[PDB]
Design a protein around this nucleic acid. Structure first.
Ligand SMILES: [Mg+2]
Ligand SMILES: [Zn+2]
Ligand SMILES: [Zn+2]
Lengths: 49, 392, 49, 1341, 144
RNA sequence: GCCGCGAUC
DNA sequence: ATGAATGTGCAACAGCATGATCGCGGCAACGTGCAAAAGTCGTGCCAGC
């Protein structure tokens, strides 16, 4: 984690929580199975504004 | 970063607190030595000491030796304690300890269905305590929550009845310790038992890789409507029969069931009953249970098969076949739509697996689950009746 | 002004400020004259840096 | 005479077939012997505390003319015995007193003294003692100390497997491992460069230290190489002839011998030419000039004309250089060997690598390399080199290290200084060069001749040495400023560092653990435990596959079976039955000397190194009557391998078939028929069975049960007993037979049995007597059998009528189906004693008195408390009932009017005091046993305390009165004899007390001598009784010096009976285990023809795959034994004649095939035959030794003797349907143990308990109401299923959502089942942690 | 060896966790030649086991030329495989996840029918975790 | 808030 | 024939090595004197019985 954080710190990047590992850490619904439909509805709302 | 308590009002300084307090201890003396017009050497040394202390606080074990506390062990810094193993293993990222969970030794229950697990009534009434409170308050037995608490501790009979009412169709999911593959955590329908150990269905032991020699399993309760549906439509034992690795049926009888099926479907050169002609599989059970014939005798039985060449329709054909009494008895449990050449063998731990696979492929899921339960029941019964024993 | 203090990091014991000058729920977000501890729900010890 | 009294009670039918030569040793000798040699006085300084004292003392100041001279030492008497020390909860130790004096030397007169103060002993330190079983009772515990198996100091050569640089170059390295000090290594480069890794610093040439040993460049070359001389006279340039040197070379020019051609240019190189040249005596001959070009000059010739000379050693020569040396007159030139056939170019290359050629330069170089700080000033480097090596104190090779150093280098002398000299480094460097050259071989690192064993005594000696060094450093400062008035205790004797170090070692160490207390077997196998870990050992992760392997020298010294399974396999061992340690610390094994072809009965003890030279025979080899082997070809072990050798080549003989195995694996019958891993599992599982309610002997054993039980200290063995006088349920007293007595005071031997007492694993320890009354008892006889022991026989299970058959899937996998007659007959019911403690300690606001009167508690909870405030003994308790009524004072000094009216309407305290009363923890039931109140001195004693002290006084006087009764009986007998001798009054004299006023005076001699002496004896005996009675009344009843904060303590014990139940684990002793699955009723178990239903039903499917043939053979053999027992029981039922019963027992005892069992009932009287027959009516307890026991034919004959089916299978009828099972079922009696893994202790269930401040997650583990951890793999499986809502609810609302938990609890109570999730606290903690660094993390909108 | 297999499973799961079937059919024509696995002279994997539960990227041609057997982009199952084995087919080109041609996921057709259920795989299944667990479930029994 | 030690699968 | 740039090879340093349970112990880092204020103690006060 020491290597990854610094290479992420200097670049100032973002996560965007696209995979399964990121959503498990945060505690939201994973984009798979039953939680996949919920993440499909949210994507349209973000794109539509 | 709270202090670790101990006997008396004394509060020991923790590892994180020591690393900080060293930094401020250096900082105050340095910021003092700035204004005293001290010689460059001493302030230089103090700057080096403060810089080293800050580095050790931020990551101990880098840029020189590692500072230690009372014991000759490194004082873990902010790096070593990010979450668990310097990463997010223990306290985050799938490492959360969960409540509404139990743990007890597992034994075997052969009377259980494919989707049932025996749950002790002492783990229940503790996993389902809030549900019991809700049902007690709903029926007016305890107007206040405190009364429900007190009567649950006193464990009256009506509390047991209400627990049985709550349990009725609330699936609960058991898992073993080294969850290797996705079949290592399955959801069963609990049946309360007057006992102290979880009763696991013998068929799912192959999937769990569990044998009853002190093995323990955890019992996690899905406590939400979405969670209950997920544990019923995605995790029920009757749902996942085919292993998601090769397509072969993971839930397949083994050990005593296979021995019983093998002993039932065998042929002896001479036994009680030779060349007898009997009406059907019904007479085979009557002759065997009466003692007039042996399980390994060879007879000719008039038997009916069902066939599925017709589109969605079953056609019945009747013929006279030469088989054994044991095979004729076994045929009574197979569903309609399977050719008789599937039980006219020895059924040695592979023919039975292919029997289940063909039943799944041709018939579906409900018939193959019922078939698996019947197969295990009859295999256990006839293996016990055989009296197979190993001697010197 | 130590590592664990009361002027910053919030209070220590519930909605009670130091010296007992203002220890109630009648006072919200007030600063005692004698001590700089602000009244809060003592769960802010997990947020102030 | 042949059999002892307890052996006459029940004779095990040994199957033998091989006579035993040496009986099993004390079986706990290592621990006791090590501590004895650690404590006992030694005239010399070999070992023990005396050796450490000689090593440190005497001490003196820096030219202060004051020295510390000491003589001897003594260990005081312990102030508590083992039992009281265990009960009270303090360390069993003794004071340490030492005799030492002060001497003051004259300052003006050299070597003269002016004062000599011979002060008395000064107390210093506490040394815990070892109990006679081998345990160190510290802090009220057992705390056994496991011996450590560590690398022996010496010289170790290794090859590093030849794969470091992947070039195929094998690299040889040497190590110098000392007992204490710095290390030293030699290392071979891929480029063949000598590197020395001193104290594991950077790699450094060996030439620097070689020069630092005051060796010049020419001298090192002369020592490390064979120099040759080239003579160039009159331009001939002759060459010396050494035929043995040149083996492989090319003749660059014609070689002529004395003017005659011997070898042509490029001629034959075979040994024939070399032999021909050697045979001809030829002087020096000329050689081509170009040949000498490749040579390197070793010495440095000096020109006689000018001081200029070619001193450049390790350099070649030039053509112009030849003219220069010819002009200078250098007729002879000295050059080294420069030959590379077996030797090679070394040393010189390293001298060319580094240019330091001075001792000072080498010293400063090594000082800078090791210490990168301040450069030295001709003193620091020299001092550092003196301290690093060849130092008396800082560095010290052990005696065993010196022995191994000398043996590895093949030196005749075995003794010497424990320090390494200059020649030693040279010798090891030479040996490394030789091993690189080809001569010699690398030694194995796992050889048991290289792995030393160290015990508790040596470790305690090392700790005491460290403490002694510290106190000596403290003392040295005193004499600098010490005056003559300063006494020894005033000179900082400073016992605190020594006691601190000793107690730190004994209490908190890697190799001093809680002793296992399930069965005597666990204690026995824990005391003699071999551990490779520890301070000087190796880390678990560090151990490779080589260490965890069974080296072929583990034959008779380390068990190959018994070892932990998962993490620690191969790192924890167990000593074999006959193994012991060397005088240096190496494991030996007995062997029998074989002279010619007959094996003698003389026994020689062979270490690991010695046994690799001889030829050792096999225990299972036949013999003749005189002693010769029955075959001319006999299997043997020569050097690690096994082959067949001639009868005349055999040199040594194995003592017995039990030699290889340990104690734990010796108690498995038919061990040879079991798989090795299954035997491992059975041996490990035997050490876990809980002692049941009633001891039950094994129907089939190995005869080693008696040795395990007797030497474990669990039983009570008659030390010198004769005929027992009075047997009690708690006491045994024996009147010793007159033939052997101690003259004066006579006396009897009294045993105080220990009743129900908690063990370390919460199990109960009980001792029940064997002898009834007036039974003669010989030396070594067992009187009281402890937990899991029957008549001195280790019995840790119960025999069960096991049938192997699948029963309707209830014995699926490894499940066990148990009958209900097992439950009814109270088998496997165990007692578990649990300890609950409470201490009354003062606080800021006052004292914490304890009383029954507890405010705010109803009369229901006060029903079971006395006037003092603790539960009555024997009250059955459960749930959470109050145990001790303890109040904690609260602070209040402002009596507000509300408090005033509260005190007015209620009591004076008005319930101000709190109630910190200890309650029964959840899940704990059972009747109380004892209460252990103790009181601080000065304070008023508890009301019940007086009853404890009165009970102690009652038992004390009752125990002392018997010897007084006997002594006054003897005195009365003597007085009666004297009065009968003269003036006898017959019964009149006996009627009047005091011998009827001492029978007046009678004769003058009797009055002056007889009566006066009798009166004097009576008076002094009465006074002696009174003084010791008073002293023992005084010391028992004394105010205990509690902890300063502690005022008064109370402890409560509970006793719970655990009946067998489905979840409880049961296992055999052949590696078969399992959990019960159902307690079936009696009427459902299968029954034979006679109607006896089986007790346990097992699964046959577990035998053929695990290869546990011991199960089947044991069941058959137990069935035969129980058939014999049933025959004897039926015979006793008809009360037939003694002759017929004796004949049957005789015909059943001598059955076998050339068994070494010569018991016979002819020399057995009538009454002991009936006692034996009534003792073995349950079953004839036969014993088959480990590797040579009952065969199939013998078992079949035993079965046929009892009128049973020979094949070992019976027709079993079903209990439910009553239909005969088609195949016969193998029915037999197997010994089933109940392990210590009970479900009552393995169930947990949490809904909402207590969380942690950080991460806000639920706690973990039982006894804390924790929750099962949803691991990473579980979440992966959840993701694989596609179940996302379950994952979300298991990640947020169950663990870390502070508001989510409460919201969802409210929703469930309402009945909503709504998610309403949130944001875990763990991620917020992680964000705060990262923000605490220099990295900023925030959540974007 | 259990530790070294668990570490491998950890790495595989971490690599493959971000993989979910998010599309129905990418329409790509790419495929992989699937011939029965042969070693020396012994038949060691028949084509039936390798091609069962996959989609045909191109129509399989019987030895008789210009004779279609199965339509393009169809799922092979027990009936199709039994019909295919009756003839003398040797090579079948089938679509696989390596050529899914979709972005951030894998088409439901390019990945064949799931092995847990008879029907084709539905959208949203986390195939990467299943694949990693399936690969790492053995390994605690591989002989090393 | 751990560290050692032992044990189970 | 010789110098410089480049590519190759070798040595030192960093991360990492399964999961879930149960049971016992042991266990760290002042001073200073005066203003300035505040609290306290011996003492005298009025109000209730
Ligand atoms: Mg198991
Ligand atoms: Zn305040
Ligand atoms: Zn695709």
């Amino acid at each position: 984690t020491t290597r990854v954080l610094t290479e992420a710190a200097v670049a100032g990047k973002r996560d965007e929580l696209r995979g399964l590992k990121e959503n498990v850490i945060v505690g939201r619904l994973i984009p798979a199975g039953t939680g996949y439909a919920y993440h499909q509805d949210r994507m349209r709302r973000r794109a539509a504004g | 970063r709270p202090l670790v308590p101990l006997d008396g009002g004394r509060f020991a300084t923790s590892d994180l607190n020591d690393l900080y307090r060293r930094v401020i201890n250096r900082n105050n003396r340095l910021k003092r030595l700035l204004d005293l017009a001290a010689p460059d050497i001493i302030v230089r040394n103090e700057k080096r000491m403060l810089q080293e202390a800050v580095d050790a606080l931020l990551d101990n074990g880098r840029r020189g030796r590692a500072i230690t506390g009372s014991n000759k062990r490194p004082l873990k810094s902010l790096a070593d304690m990010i979450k668990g193993k310097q990463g997010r293993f223990r306290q985050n990222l799938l490492g959360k300890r969960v409540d509404y969970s139990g743990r007890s030794v597992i034994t075997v229950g052969p009377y259980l269905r494919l989707h049932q697990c025996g749950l002790p009534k002492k783990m229940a009434l503790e996993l389902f305590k809030p549900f019991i409170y809700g049902k007690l308050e709903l029926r007016g037995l305890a107007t206040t929550i405190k009364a429900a608490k007190k009567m649950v501790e006193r464990e009256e009979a009506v509390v047991w009845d209400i627990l049985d009412e709550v349990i009725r169709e609330h699936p609960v999911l058991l898992n073993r310790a080294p969850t290797l593959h996705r079949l290592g955590i399955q959801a069963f329908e609990p049946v309360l038992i007057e006992g102290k150990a979880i009763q696991l269905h013998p068929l799912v032991c192959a999937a769990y890789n569990a044998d009853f020699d002190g093995d323990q399993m955890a019992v996690h309760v899905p406590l939400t409507l979405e969670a209950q549906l997920e544990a019923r439509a995605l995790m029920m034992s009757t749902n996942n029969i085919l292993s998601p690795a090769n397509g072969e049926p993971i839930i397949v009888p083994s050990q005593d069931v296979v021995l019983g099926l093998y002993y039932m479907t065998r042929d002896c050169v001479n036994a009680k009953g030779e060349g007898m002609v009997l009406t059907g599989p019904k007479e085979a059970e009557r002759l065997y249970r009466s003692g007039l014939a042996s399980l390994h005798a060879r007879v000719k039985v008039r038997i009916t098969e069902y066939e599925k060449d017709a589109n969605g329709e079953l056609v019945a054909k009747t013929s006279l076949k030469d088989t054994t009494v044991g095979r004729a008895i076994l045929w009574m449990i197979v569903p309609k739509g399977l050719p008789y050449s599937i039980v006219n063998q020895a059924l040695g731990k592979k023919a039975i697996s292919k029997m289940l696979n063909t039943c799944y492929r041709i018939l579906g899921l409900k018939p193959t689950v019922i078939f698996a339960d019947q197969i295990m029941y009859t295999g256990f019964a006839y293996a016990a009746r055989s009296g197979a024993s190993v001697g010197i | 002004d130590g590592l664990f203090c009361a002027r910053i990091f919030g209070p220590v014991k519930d909605y009670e400020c130091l010296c007992g000058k203002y220890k109630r729920l009648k006072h919200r977000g007030v600063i005692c004259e004698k001590c700089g501890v602000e009244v809060t729900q003592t769960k802010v010890r997990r947020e102030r840096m | 005479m042949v059999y002892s009294y307890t052996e006459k009670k029940r004779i095990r039918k040994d199957f033998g077939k091989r006579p035993q030569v040496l009986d099993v040793p004390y079986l706990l000798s290592i621990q006791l012997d090590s501590f004895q040699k650690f404590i006992e006085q030694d005239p010399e300084g070999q070992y023990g505390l005396e050796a450490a004292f000689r090593s440190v003392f005497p001490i003196q100041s820096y030219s202060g003319n004051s020295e510390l001279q000491y003589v001897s030492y003594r260990l005081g008497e312990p102030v508590f015995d083992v039992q009281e020390c265990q009960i009270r909860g303090v360390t069993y130790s003794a004071p340490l007193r030492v005799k030492l004096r002060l001497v003051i030397y004259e300052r003006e007169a050299p070597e003269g003294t002016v004062k000599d103060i011979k002060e008395q002993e000064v107390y210093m330190g506490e040394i815990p003692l070892m109990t006679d079983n081998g345990t160190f009772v510290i802090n009220g515990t057992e705390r056994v100390i496991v011996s450590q198996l560590h690398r022996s100091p010496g010289v170790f050569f290794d090859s590093d497997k030849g794969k470091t640089h992947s070039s195929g170059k094998v690299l040889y390295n040497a190590r110098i491992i000392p007992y204490r000090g710095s290390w030293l290594d030699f290392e071979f480069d891929p480029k063949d460069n000598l590197f020395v890794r001193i104290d594991r610093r950077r790699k450094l040439p060996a030439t620097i230290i070689l020069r630092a040993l005051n060796y010049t460049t020419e001298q090192i070359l002369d020592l490390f190489f064979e120099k040759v001389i080239f003579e160039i006279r009159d331009n001939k340039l002759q060459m010396e002839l050494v035929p043995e040197r040149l083996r492989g070379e090319t003749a660059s020019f014609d070689i002529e011998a004395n003017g005659k051609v011997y070898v042509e240019k490029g001629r034959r190189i075979t040994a024939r030419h070399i032999r021909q040249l050697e045979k001809d005596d030829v002087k020096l001959i000329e050689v081509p000039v170009e040949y000498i070009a490749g040579k390197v000059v070793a010495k440095d010739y000096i020109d006689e004309s000018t001081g200029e000379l070619i001193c450049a050693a390790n350099m070649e020569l030039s053509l112009d250089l030849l003219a220069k040396l010819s002009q200078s007159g250098h007729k002879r030139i000295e050059t080294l060997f420069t030959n590379d056939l077996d030797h090679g170019p070394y040393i010189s290359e390293t001298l060319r690598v580094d240019p330091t050629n001075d001792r000072l330069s080498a010293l400063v170089e090594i000082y800078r390399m090791m210490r990168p700080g301040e450069p030295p000033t001709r003193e620091a480097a020299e001092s550092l080199f003196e301290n690093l090596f060849f130092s008396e104190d800082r560095y010290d090779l052990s005696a065993v290290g010196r022995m191994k150093f000398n043996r590895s280098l093949l030196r005749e002398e075995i003794e010497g200084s424990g320090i390494l000299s200059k020649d030693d480094i040279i010798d090891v460097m030479k040996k490394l060069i030789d091993i690189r050259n080809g001569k010699g071989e690398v030694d194995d690192i796992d050889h048991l001749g290289n792995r030393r064993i160290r015990s508790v005594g040596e470790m305690a000696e090392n700790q005491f040495r460290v403490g002694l060094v510290r106190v000596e450093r403290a003392v040295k400062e005193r004499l600098s400023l010490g005056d003559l008035d300063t006494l020894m205790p005033q000179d900082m004797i400073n016992a605190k560092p020594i006691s601190a170090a000793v107690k730190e070692f004994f209490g908190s160490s890697q190799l001093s653990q809680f002793m296992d207390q399930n069965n005597p077997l666990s204690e026995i196998t824990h005391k003699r435990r071999i551990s490779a870990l520890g301070p000087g050992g190796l880390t678990r992760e560090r151990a490779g596959f080589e260490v965890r392997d069974v080296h072929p020298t583990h034959y008779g010294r380390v068990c190959p079976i018994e070892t932990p399974e998962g993490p620690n396999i191969g790192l924890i061992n167990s000593l074999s039955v006959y193994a012991q340690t060397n005088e240096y610390g190496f494991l030996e094994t007995p062997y029998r000397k074989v002279t010619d072809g007959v094996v003698t009965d003389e026994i020689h003890y062979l270490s690991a190194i010695e046994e690799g030279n001889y030829v050792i025979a096999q225990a299972n080899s036949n013999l003749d009557e005189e002693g010769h082997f029955v075959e001319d070809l006999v299997t043997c072990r020569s050097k690690g391998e096994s082959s067949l050798f001639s009868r005349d080549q055999v040199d040594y003989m194995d003592v017995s078939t039990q030699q290889v195995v340990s104690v734990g694996a010796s108690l498995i019958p038919f061990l040879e028929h079991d798989d090795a891993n299954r035997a491992l599992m059975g041996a490990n599982m035997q050490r876990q069975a809980v002692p049941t309610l009633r001891a039950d002997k094994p129907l089939v054993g190995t005869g080693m049960e008696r040795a395990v039980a007797v030497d474990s200290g669990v039983t009570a063995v008659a030390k010198r007993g004769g005929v027992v006088q009075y047997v009690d349920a708690s006491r045994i007293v024996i009147k010793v037979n007159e033939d052997e007595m101690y003259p004066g005071e006579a006396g009897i031997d009294i045993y105080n049995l220990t009743k129900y007492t908690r063990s370390n694993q919460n199990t109960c320890i009980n001792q029940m007597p064997c002898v009834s009354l007036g039974e003669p008892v010989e030396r070594g006889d067992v009187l009281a059998d402890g937990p899991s022991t029957d008549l001195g026989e280790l019995a840790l299970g119960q025999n069960m009528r096991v049938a192997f058959m699948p029963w309707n899937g209830y014995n699926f996998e490894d499940s066990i189906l148990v009958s209900e007659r097992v439950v009814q007959e109270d088998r496997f019911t165990t007692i578990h004693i649990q300890e609950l403690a409470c201490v009354s300690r003062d606080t800021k606001l006052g004292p914490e008195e304890i009383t029954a009167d507890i405010p705010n508690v109803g009369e229901a909870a006060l029903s079971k408390l006395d006037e003092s405030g603790i539960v009555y003994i024997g009250a059955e308790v459960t749930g959470g009932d109050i145990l001790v009524g303890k109040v904690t004072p609260k602070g209040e000094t402002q009596l507000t009017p509300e408090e005033k009216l509260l005190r007015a309407i209620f009591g004076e305290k008005a319930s101000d005091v709190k109630d910190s009363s200890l309650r029964v923890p959840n899940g704990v039931s059972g009747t109380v046993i004892d209460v252990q109140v103790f009181t601080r001195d000065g304070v008023e004693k508890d009301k019940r305390a007086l009853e404890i002290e009165e009970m102690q006084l009652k038992q004390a006087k009752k125990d002392l009165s018997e010897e007084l009764q006997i002594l006054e009986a003897g005195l009365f007998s003597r007085i009666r004899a004297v009065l009968v001798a003269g003036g006898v009054e017959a019964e009149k004299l006996d009627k009047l007390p005091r011998d009827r006023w001492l029978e007046l005076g009678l004769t003058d001699e009797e009055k002056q001598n007889q009566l006066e002496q009798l009166a004097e004896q009576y008076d002094e005996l009465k006074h002696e009784f009174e003084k010791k009675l008073e002293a023992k009344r005084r010391k028992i009843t004394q105010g205990d010096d509690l902890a300063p904060g502690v005022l008064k303590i109370v402890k409560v014990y509970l006793a719970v009976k655990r009946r067998i139940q489905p979840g409880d684990k049961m296992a055999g002793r052949h590696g078969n285990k399992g959990v019960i699955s159902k307690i079936n009723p009696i009427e459902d178990m299968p029954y034979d023809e006679n109607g006896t239903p089986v007790d346990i039903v097992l699964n046959p499917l577990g035998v053929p795959s695990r290869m546990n043939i011991g199960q089947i053979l044991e069941t058959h053999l137990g069935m035969a034994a129980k058939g014999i027992g049933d025959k004897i029981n039926a015979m006793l039922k008809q009360q037939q004649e003694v002759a017929k019963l004796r004949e049957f027992i005789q015909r059943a005892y001598d059955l076998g095939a050339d068994v070494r069992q010569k018991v016979d009932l002819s020399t057995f009287s009538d009454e002991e035959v009936m006692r034996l027959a009534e003792n073995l009516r349950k079953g004839m307890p036969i014993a088959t030794p480990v590797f040579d026991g009952a065969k199939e034919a013998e078992i079949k004959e035993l079965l046929k003797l009892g009128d049973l089916p020979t094949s070992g299978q019976i027709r079993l009828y079903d209990g439910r349907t009553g239909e005969q099972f088609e195949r016969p079922v193998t029915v037999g009696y197997m010994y089933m143990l109940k392990l210590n893994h009970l479900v009552d202790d393995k169930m947990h269930a949490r809904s909402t308990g207590s969380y942690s401040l950080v991460t806000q997650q639920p706690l973990g583990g039982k006894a804390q109401f924790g929750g099962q951890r949803f691991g990473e793999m579980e979440v992966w499986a959840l993701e694989a299923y596609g179940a996302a809502y379950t994952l979300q609810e298991m990640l947020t609302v169950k663990s870390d959502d502070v508001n989510g938990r409460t919201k969802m609890y409210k929703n469930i109570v309402d009945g909503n089942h709504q998610m309403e999730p949130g944001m875990p606290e763990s991620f917020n903690v992680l964000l705060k942690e990262i923000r605490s660094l220099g990295i900023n993390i925030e959540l974007e909108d | 060896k259990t530790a070294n297999s668990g570490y491998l499973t950890r790495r595989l799961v971490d690599v493959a966790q971000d993989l979910v079937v998010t599309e129905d059919d990418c329409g790509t024509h790419e495929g992989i030649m699937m011939t029965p696995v042969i070693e020396g002279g012994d038949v060691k994997e028949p084509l039936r086991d390798r091609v069962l539960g996959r989609v045909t990227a191109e129509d399989v041609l019987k030895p008789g030329t210009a004779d279609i057997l199965v339509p393009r982009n169809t799922l092979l199952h027990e009936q199709w495989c039994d019909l295919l084995e009756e003839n003398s087919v040797d090579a079948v080109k089938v679509r696989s996840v390596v050529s899914c041609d979709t972005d951030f996921g894998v088409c439901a057709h390019c990945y064949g029918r799931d092995l847990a259920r008879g029907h084709i795989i539905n959208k949203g299944e986390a195939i990467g975790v299943i694949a990693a667990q399936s690969i790492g479930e053995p390994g605690t029994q591989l002989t090393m």
